[PDB]
Amino acid sequence: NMAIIKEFMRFKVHMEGSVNGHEFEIEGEGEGRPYEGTQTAKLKVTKGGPLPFAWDILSPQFSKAYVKHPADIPDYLKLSFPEGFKWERVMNFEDGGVVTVTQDSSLQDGEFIYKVKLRGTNFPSDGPVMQKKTMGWVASSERMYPEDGALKGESKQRLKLKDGGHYDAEFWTTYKAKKPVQLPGAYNVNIKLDITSHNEDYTIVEQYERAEGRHSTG
């Protein structure tokens, strides 16, 4: 594909946040194919590095304009441009850790601009986040539904651990376009989020994500 959202699109992202009181900032740039549901990003820690916690709690915050949608499911977040949308998320981890996130997405000079604010709290000092024992997210499915003029998503998520175990979380997100555009019915978004490279201290990280909406639960 279209005039506003092109078949190849870049983005810039800024994150400011704190986890268990440790403040940091990240700047990154990404690119992808919004109609194909694929994207990559290159992130750099610009303040507060090296981070004393697992990168994996940050990785899901860096883009659902890049979800492949069939023609019969309205692509609410693409339709929100050029003005864009906001989102707010809660992640509750099974050991009491909590991350809350707010985000603004806009389009400027043909590139998406993402601004993220993040607060992680109550992570046990002994747990896998503060001890950097996580090893990426398993592939997941986000159940989407419209409610009160916004698009909501809920998912059960799981981190792999160095010890061969797992560490679970429940995510709740609300996505709201800045202008009335058409909301979809309920559907599922299948996501695979990969860390494709990083330096030793995770101050330089590259990610890849593939996301596609479907009716099927298979």
Swiss-Prot record:
Question: What InterPro entries does the entry give?
Answer: GFP, GFP-related, Green_fluorescent_prot
The record's Gene Ontology biological-process terms are: bioluminescence; generation of precursor metabolites and energy
Q: Does the keyword Nucleus apply?
A: no
- What does this protein do, in the record's words? Thought to play a role in photoprotection of the coral's resident symbiont microalgae's photosystems from photoinhibition caused by high light levels found near the surface of coral reefs. In deeper water, the fluorescence may be to convert blue light into longer wavelengths more suitable for use in photosynthesis by the microalgal symbionts.
Q: What is stated as this protein's family in its record?
A: Belongs to the GFP family.
Q: What is the protein's name according to its record?
A: Red fluorescent protein drFP583
Report which superkingdom the organism of origin falls in.
Eukaryota
- Keyword Endoplasmic reticulum (UniProt): no
> What post-translational modification information does the record give?
Contains a chromophore consisting of modified amino acid residues. The chromophore is formed by autocatalytic backbone condensation between Xaa-N and Gly-(N+2), oxidation of Tyr-(N+1) to didehydrotyrosine, and formation of a double bond to the alpha-amino nitrogen of residue Xaa-N. Maturation of the chromophore requires nothing other than molecular oxygen.
Identify the keywords attached in UniProt to this record, alphabetized: Chromophore, Luminescence, Photoprotein
Provide the assembly information: Homotetramer.
- What Pfam families does this protein's entry cite? GFP
Record note on biotechnological use: Fluorescent proteins have become a useful and ubiquitous tool for making chimeric proteins, where they function as a fluorescent protein tag. Typically they tolerate N- and C-terminal fusion to a broad variety of proteins. They have been expressed in most known cell types and are used as a noninvasive fluorescent marker in living cells and organisms. They enable a wide range of applications where they have functioned as a cell lineage tracer, reporter of gene expression, or as a measure of protein-protein interactions.
The protein's matches in SUPFAM superfamilies, at most eight in alphabetical order, are given as: GFP-like (SSF54511)
